[PDB]
Amino acid sequence: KLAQQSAGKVLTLLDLSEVQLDGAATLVLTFSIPLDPDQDFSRVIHVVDKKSGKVDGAWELSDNLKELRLRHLEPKRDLIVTIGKEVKALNNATFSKDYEKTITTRDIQPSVGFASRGSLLPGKVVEGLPVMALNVNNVDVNFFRVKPESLPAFISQWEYRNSLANWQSDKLLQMADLVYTGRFDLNPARNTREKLLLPLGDIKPLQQAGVYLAVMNQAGRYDYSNPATLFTLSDIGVSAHRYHNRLDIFTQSLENGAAQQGIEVSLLNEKGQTLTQATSDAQGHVQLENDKNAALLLARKDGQTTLLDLKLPALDLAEFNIAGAPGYSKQFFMFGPRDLYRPGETVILNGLLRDADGKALPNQPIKLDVIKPDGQVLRSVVSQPENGLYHFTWPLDSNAATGMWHIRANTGDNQYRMWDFHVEDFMPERMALNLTGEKTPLTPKDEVKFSVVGYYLYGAPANGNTLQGQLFLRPLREAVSALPGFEFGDIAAENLSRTLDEVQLTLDDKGRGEVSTESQWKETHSPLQVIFQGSLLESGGRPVTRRAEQAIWPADALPGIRPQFASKSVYDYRTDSTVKQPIVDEGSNAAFDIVYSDAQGVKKAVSGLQVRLIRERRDYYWNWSEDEGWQSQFDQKDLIENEQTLDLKADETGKVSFPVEWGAYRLEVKAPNEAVSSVRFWAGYSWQDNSDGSGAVRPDRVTLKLDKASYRPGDTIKLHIAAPTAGKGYAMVESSEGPLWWQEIDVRAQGLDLTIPVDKTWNRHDLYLSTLVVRPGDKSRSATPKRAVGVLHLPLGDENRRLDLALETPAKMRPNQPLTVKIKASTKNGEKPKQVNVLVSAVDSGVLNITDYVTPDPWQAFFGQKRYGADIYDIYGQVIEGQGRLAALRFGGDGDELKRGGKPPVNHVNIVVQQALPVTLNEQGEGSVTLPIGDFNGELRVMAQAWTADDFGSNESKVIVAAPVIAELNMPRFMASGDTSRLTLDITNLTDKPQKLNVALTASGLLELVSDSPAAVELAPGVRTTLFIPVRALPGYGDGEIQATISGLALPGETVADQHKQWKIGVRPAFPAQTVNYGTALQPGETWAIPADGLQNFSPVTLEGQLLLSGKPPLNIARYIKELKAYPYGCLEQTASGLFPSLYTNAAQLQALGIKGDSDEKRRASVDIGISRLLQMQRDNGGFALWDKNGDEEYWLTAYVMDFLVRAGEQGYSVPTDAINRGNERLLRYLQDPGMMSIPYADNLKASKFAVQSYAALVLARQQKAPLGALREIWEHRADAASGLPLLQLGVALKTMGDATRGEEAIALALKTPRNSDERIWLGDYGSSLRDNALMLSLLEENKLLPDEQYTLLNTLSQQAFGERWLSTQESNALFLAARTIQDLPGKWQAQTSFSAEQLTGEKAQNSNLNSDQLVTLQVSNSGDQPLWLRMDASGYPQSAPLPANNVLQIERHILGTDGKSKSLDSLRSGDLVLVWLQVKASNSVPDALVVDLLPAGLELENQNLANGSASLEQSGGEVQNLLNQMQQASIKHIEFRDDRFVAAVAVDEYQPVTLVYLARAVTPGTYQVPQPMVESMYVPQWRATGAAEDLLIVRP
């Protein structure tokens, strides 16, 4: 037998060692060859203990006969093993001599303990209590019964403490009580572990229901692995599950699991009150309509009782696939072009409401709300369905916070439909980078290589710059662009996709670098590519990412396969993303196109091609694990099905047709040069994904199976129950509104196949099969779970409902050309696409890739799987854990670092996106859509949704776009007037042939070329060049632009127009605009004339003026309008004050003043976006803040914004109710609780609180929401007022509420209490005597109060208003309302102006515009018989810098080096870093100070806040560090880093001068004017300063 194989082999004792065979220690002798069984081993192999003598026990040969054994060794005993010479092997081999081994047995101490630390699953006393034992004759045990009142705590304490074996403690024992104790005798086999079972049936207390805790006494030398254990023991039980407002109890006897009738079930709450009660039916079911606050169930029958804690968590179902949408009711589809966005971008959204079955429903409004990341609403709108398609479209504010924005929707079911969409800004690049590869594909033997070239845009090499990147290897299935749809390479090939190495290198002085890697695929039979995702890091660490593919062809020509059959968009939950994959009907032939094309795309002749049709197969099998648990493993196997020998000819496309059975398939073809190419395709709709258990059996429970992948109401289901063990229970199709099937008893043995007839009325996708069974085993042999549950989704959505959309777009297209998209809806058998609607759109792939955005699928949106509608609960043993469902991963979240870096200084990035209006397909289902693509270079993803009534569809297709030639100008973001700049026009030739370009440069607007346009420009392929374009900015504010028209190109076989690019940039004058404001009343015969010296400074090109004339004193509303409009900064008060003129003016009224402006629709839209801008500033408490939502509340400004919002609501503009409500609550808080307010900068707190209370009283009184008692209490403290304005507002507030007497007293007192003239006294009301007189004037005229005083107040206000040189936005607004009050005041007048021959005349005030020529010689005489008031407001930009000056405020600027030494502005090199040092002082406190420092052009701001200490370098100290420390002490209210200026709101202290610091970098070479540093109080304009500055700044290359 075995002796033959062992023949000729010498016998040898290979080993002698103790091993733990079974539970026993065992001596083992391992011989080299098998032994003879017949021999008496006791005669030949002695074993003698040194003390106790010869050891008992016969030897036991191994089945392999090479291992002798001796069980039940004594612990820690010395042993002498004498092996005899005469021992015989099966081949009659024998030892040459006797051997004497010695061995000391391991010191194995006796052990005893419970088999487990415990479990919550109920058992029976007959089952006994398991106990592992080893060499232990006894074990004392102390039983305990936990107090039910302490039960919830004890078990909780049992949960986190059970990790260690000795979890028992006195604190735990005190919550329990002793019931029995005593020693249990044991007789395990000697030196052998055994699972003994402690009897429990003679213990009387154990007969009673309850949880129990056994605790072994640890006396003696015995080891104790598990001293304590827990076990529940109870009788009657209940099982149930709820569906929102409904629940279905199932009572049953625990002895058999059979359903019991007549049990009474009460619904107790947390208070224990009985909300309801019901008796079980014959099937034991007890339906009840309980919603939330369900707590306890109380079953009772024949004295038996059982409670169920509903408050306990529902049984975990993570192992089950219960995931899905929660829209069981009406389904509002919400979809858009992209989930990613930028601040200032126009978010777009589309909606499609449908029923649960996806059927059409009558049109209804839907309330959309735009939530912010803080959770506060931004805006709310009542969306409407035009032609059955909802379409939101709103513009994000530039200042809007970055984060996870979402737009909730309300269909009226009060279940909001969240729609998350990313909103993040991006920093502009500042370094060019290039990663050139090879055009011709590499051989597999060839080393991969890439050339890197990076350089600064301002004109320097990236010397020493870090370059970090990654190298990826990917299959090149689409190696031939000339033959789209064809696939190349073996799909069956393994390791075609893996990371190579992490590139990281330093560029040389030239900035050049190389990236090379050795080939690791020399034996490849398939095309491959090595992507190089490099990144050129800045000194600040910001990287310029770039990619560079490199084709790798195994041979000069390769086989290529195409699938003619359409790829239907099968859904997959594995990626939560519908995607089209190739497929074909079972039993049908599969066509395929075959080619032998090269890289050029021309087809080469070939013969002997090996076209095989491999048939893929898979076999699932479950597998338990420790670190992984149970898993759904599967084995794959390939089997050849058929073979063919194709012989392609030159310029020919072969067409094979292989018949197909079912399941996964793979068609391969092998070229003679060992090239291989293959394409997988599935014969069934039941597509399988990786790590997806399409058909496998999980341990225990019920692995339900369906005979069909999908079902219809006319279809009959046949579920296959397969419980591990026999047990009664139930099965049913549960739904969100409740179960379909009710009772359904089941008694599985080793599997059962019940038939399920689906009803026709089931128009829902939320249906879910469910099963339960329980084993009544008297003795729990091999453990085995008692309860078992099986949930499975039931498919129902028909395939026919899907539309076969078929987009047709070119694979490639030129930039600035209109892409065409052909639509073709269809369906099998039907082929009747009636009135189909399609919504074509296109988005850049580089935007969608950041979030891996999926094309929306309406079919999945409606017919897709819904989430489980029930919540399981039962007293049976708790589910293990299930470890949770498997989860996908990418690379985590993004967009956090930019927040750390601060807000970007207005990026110029171009986000390509398009969405054409929805179109109706014709009778053939054919359609077309033309999208006008702009100047863009990259892949462009096209997407298209389609819909009718119940039919739905979706499709997508890539469209590459590439320009023949690249042309990128590099210019400063802005240019000051008179500045010169050296532009650099980059030009790249990516074409394979040289070009002779002709660049006709041109300029327009406030810009002018210095040099003549360049002549011919030769350009070799792959070569970039840089034209130099000197330029100069024309004087005055406005826009400038540079056009370029490259000509030539000369592309064979393709006519094309010459390139046309344009570059527009702003032109802001280096100095602030100056104004003159004359005004006087003329007696008849008198003549006024403008002083000659008043216009000497203004440049004629920028100068402009206005001349008002009236028979009564006037106000120049046009000036207030122009000033409110001209203000740039976005703080709240300035925003509202700038919003009022838009609110009360109209295009006719505006044109009448001679002012030019936007159309009324655009104006109202500006009012809307402005209201959103105001809502952006709102605090969470409903208050408002001056600069940011996180800032301190501004009460008076809160009432101000409340006033503008209310009056805007009076104008019909929409505002959210929640904001007005919270703000009214804030004003009411201002009225009822004055003392909570905090106004630290106020000198007179009582006057401030009185002003806030009064203005809030007015804003509330206008809404009729102000209580009379609060107004009276405020009236009691009338003395507190420091101005008459609050008294007047309080008087209107009193008179409005019917307290006419106190209100009349207040209005009377208000005109008799002038505001203090001392500007130093800060009230915090943002007011002045001018603003107060104007606002009081408007308040008087609006309520028709005291007409006699209105005239004197008007004459005074008119006398004081015109003469001011500077005005706060608040004063400009109050003067605007005051002028609006008097715009139609009668007053005849005549005049004889110098600019007109005809006499002027008017029944009312008139404002004629004037040019500078009219202004220089202006002269107005009063030809009338009555006095003639006149005003003259001119403005313009000075030709030269005004002399530096100061009033209260003081400021000075000091340019510095990075090392902190002084640095002259002249002879500044390009790319130089500089540290600007602003310094501010004041003779008085200036809480509302604003520091403005306009940048000279050629200097560009670094977007870093030095106050936070962030900087390009921290290594420097001394001169720089103390400055940063001083900036740290500054009370900065706000800061900004605009392209043209540095801004910093601050609260200057008289004894603590401010020290502002900021980085800047020279970029573009040229001469530049240098703006003077400026600082000014925002509401006390007279307090202001402008310091000295150098005349020029000469940047150099």
DSSP string over 898-925: HHHT---S-------EEEPPPEE--TTS
Give the Cα separation of 1168 and 1216 in Å (integer): 12
Any idea which residue has 């000729």 for tokens?
Answer: 8
What's the CATH number of domain 1068-1112+1386-1440, 2.60.120.1540, 1.10.30.50, 3.20.20.60, 3.30.420.130? 2.60.120.1540
Measured in degrees and rounded to the nearest 5, phi and psi for residue 371 equal -75, 145
Provide the resolution (angstroms): 16.0
Give the Cα separation of 650 and 1540 in Å (integer): 64
Give the Cα separation of 1340 and 1350 in Å (integer): 7
Is 1113-1385 the same fold as 1068-1112+1386-1440? no
Fold for 979-1055, please state it. Answer: Immunoglobulin-like (2.60.40)
Measured in degrees and rounded to the nearest 5, phi and psi for residue 1120 equal -65, -35
* Nearest in space to 979 (alpha carbons), one of 1010, 933, 943, 1023: 1010
Q: Cα–Cα distances in Å, from 1313 out to 370, 1301, 1355?
A: 46, 19, 18
Fold for 1445-1596, please state it. Answer: Immunoglobulin-like (2.60.40)
Which amino acid would we find at residue 679?
V
Judge whether 107 and 75 are in contact, CB under 8 Å.
yes
In angstroms, how far is CA 1525 from the centroid of its own chain? Answer: 37
Judge whether 313 and 291 are in contact, CB under 8 Å.
no
Measured in degrees and rounded to the nearest 5, phi and psi for residue 769 equal -65, 145
Q: Cα–Cα distances in Å, from 208 out to 125, 141, 1085?
A: 10, 19, 119
Count of Cβ atoms closer than 10 Å to residue 1099 Cβ: 16
* DSSP assigned state of 991: S
Angle at 239 between CA 234 and CA 241, to 5 degrees: 150
Count of Cβ atoms closer than 10 Å to residue 775 Cβ: 18
* Nearest in space to 388 (alpha carbons), one of 955, 952, 913, 954: 952
Measured in degrees and rounded to the nearest 5, phi and psi for residue 807 equal -70, 145
Give the Cα separation of 1024 and 1041 in Å (integer): 24
Class for the domain spanning 238-309: mainly beta
CATH architecture of 3-104: Sandwich (2.60)
Any idea which residue has 């890739």 for tokens?
Answer: 849
Residues paired with 1478 in a beta bridge: 1453, 1556
660 backbone φψ class: left, alpha, beta (φ>0; ψ -120 to 50): beta
Q: Cα–Cα distances in Å, from 242 out to 238, 270, 337, 1113, 1597?
A: 13, 17, 39, 78, 76
Beta strand 498-506 pairing with 466-475:
antiparallel
Judge whether 1178 and 1184 are in contact, CB under 8 Å.
yes
Alpha-carbon Rg for the chain in angstroms: 44
Fold for 1113-1385, please state it. Answer: Glycosyltransferase (1.50.10)
Judge whether 1101 and 1069 are in contact, CB under 8 Å.
no
Give the Cα separation of 610 and 597 in Å (integer): 16
Length, in residues, of the chain: 1597
* DSSP assigned state of 661: -
* Nearest in space to 1221 (alpha carbons), one of 1175, 1186, 1188: 1175
**CA pseudo-torsion sign 1151, 1157, 1159, 1161:** negative
Class for the domain spanning 570-624+631-682: mainly beta
Give the Cα separation of 224 and 239 in Å (integer): 38
Residues paired with 391 in a beta bridge: 350
Give the Cα separation of 672 and 341 in Å (integer): 51
Task: Identify the three-state secondary structure at position 122.
Answer: coil
Q: Say yes or no: domain 331-423 is CATH 2.60.40.1930.
A: yes
For residue 896, what are the contacts with CB-CB under 8 A and spacing of at least 6? none
Give the Cα separation of 1431 and 1413 in Å (integer): 18
Any alpha helices (H) in 1146-1299, and if so which ranges?
1147-1152, 1160-1176, 1195-1210, 1217-1232, 1245-1262, 1268-1276, 1284-1296
Give the Cα separation of 765 and 708 in Å (integer): 16
Structure tokens at 907: 């990026």
Give the Cα separation of 585 and 659 in Å (integer): 11
Any idea which residue has 């479990």 for tokens?
Answer: 119
For residue 586, what are the contacts with CB-CB under 8 A and spacing of at least 6? 660, 661, 662, 683, 684
The per-residue b/e assignment along 680-709, b for 16 or more CB within 10 angstroms, e otherwise, is bbbbbeebbeeebbeebbbebbbbbebeee
Structure tokens at 462: 């990236």
Judge whether 821 and 806 are in contact, CB under 8 Å.
no
**Residue ranges of the domains in the chain?**
3-104, 111-233, 238-309, 331-423, 570-624+631-682, 979-1055, 1068-1112+1386-1440, 1113-1385, 1445-1596
Which amino acid would we find at residue 1480?
V
Burial of 1301: CB neighbours in 10 Å, binned 0-12, 13-18, 19+ = exposed
In angstroms, how far is CA 1078 from the centroid of its own chain? Answer: 57
Give the Cα separation of 239 and 222 in Å (integer): 43
Count of Cβ atoms closer than 10 Å to residue 470 Cβ: 16
In angstroms, how far is CA 1436 from the centroid of its own chain? Answer: 47
Strand ranges of the sheet holding 871-874, from the earlier edge strand across to the other edge: 285-288, 246-252, 237-243, 871-874
Give the Cα separation of 422 and 848 in Å (integer): 11
Class for the domain spanning 111-233: mainly beta
